Each structure stands twice: as C-alpha cells, then as structure tokens.
Amino acid sequence: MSFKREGDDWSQLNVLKKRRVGDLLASYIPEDEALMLRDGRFACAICPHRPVLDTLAMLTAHRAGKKHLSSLQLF
RNA sequence: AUGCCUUAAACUUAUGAGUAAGGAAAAUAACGAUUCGGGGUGACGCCCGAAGAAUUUUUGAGC
Ligand SMILES: [Zn+2]
C-alpha cells in the first residue's frame, strides 16, 4: 500500500470533508461575527441572544435567515 | 505561487434495513377588549363564557 495506495478510510475521509467545509465557509465569516465555543460549536455574535449552532453550515444558513438580517442592521 | 497534452483521466467523490428518545436553528401563526364569573397554574401564561344644546361663558328665561 506504499507504492500504490490501496483502499480508502471512509470515516476519516468524512472527517476531512467536515474540515474542508468548515474552512471554506469560515473564510466568508468575519472574525467578530462568530464565536467558537469550547466544544466546537458556534454562536452568532450579532444577534443579541447569541444563538448557538452546531456546525458552520448551520451558522451560514442562520446568517441567511431573516431574524439575523433584522438583528444585523441594528449593528 | 510553471507551460503543455483527450477541462490530462472517455477515473470517483461511497455510506443497508429498522426501534425508542432528545437538542438547535430555518420556516411559519398572532400583538393592547376593557372588567366580571368559572377551568387551570407555585405564580403568571393560557382556556371557556357575558356586556363638544343639561347649573361658571357659544344654542338664551326672555319679552
Ligand atoms: Zn445571527
């Protein structure tokens, strides 16, 4: 398996996929807007009640939503 | 972070069937009908019912 690679570890590949999705989506979120918690979750720092969201995919989908946009323009 | 060849590949980016139970967002429905009685609740929530002409000035007691 050294000379030509054999097989693939689909669980670790899925871990890598989660990292690459995270890096991609994170580069479009400015550093003030998102606060990363101790366990790897994310809070929205715009919205006054700080909702906490499990992934960066959910944080991006939240930042699309109308509650966030209304809370955004006040800040 | 170097140019070219058939975007170099006429290669693939897979992840079964169910049981029971939670968390978070998106989306979406409403705002003031006042008091009284009853249901409910630790308490509110909530729910069910009922209802500008009259003594100090400008619409005259004046003739
Ligand atoms: Zn937000």
Side-chain angles (χ1 to χ4, degrees), chain A residues 33 44-49 51 53 59 62-63 67-69 71:
Chain A
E33 278 68 355
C44 177
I46 281 99
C47 299
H49 62 287
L53 300 104
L59 181 62
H62 162 70
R63 290 164 64 100
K67 185 192 288 279
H68 177 81
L69 294 175
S71 300

Side-chain angles (χ1 to χ4, degrees), chain A residues 20-58:
Chain A
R20 293 189 300 119
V21 173
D23 287 330
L24 172 80
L25 294 182
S27 71
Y28 297 139
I29 289 174
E31 294 175 349
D32 198 356
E33 278 68 355
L35 178 63
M36 172 173 165
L37 274 71
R38 177 175 66 173
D39 43 349
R41 295 174 191 257
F42 287 96
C44 177
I46 281 99
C47 299
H49 62 287
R50 267 106 181 99
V52 53
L53 300 104
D54 300 332
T55 60
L56 278 172
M58 290 292 283

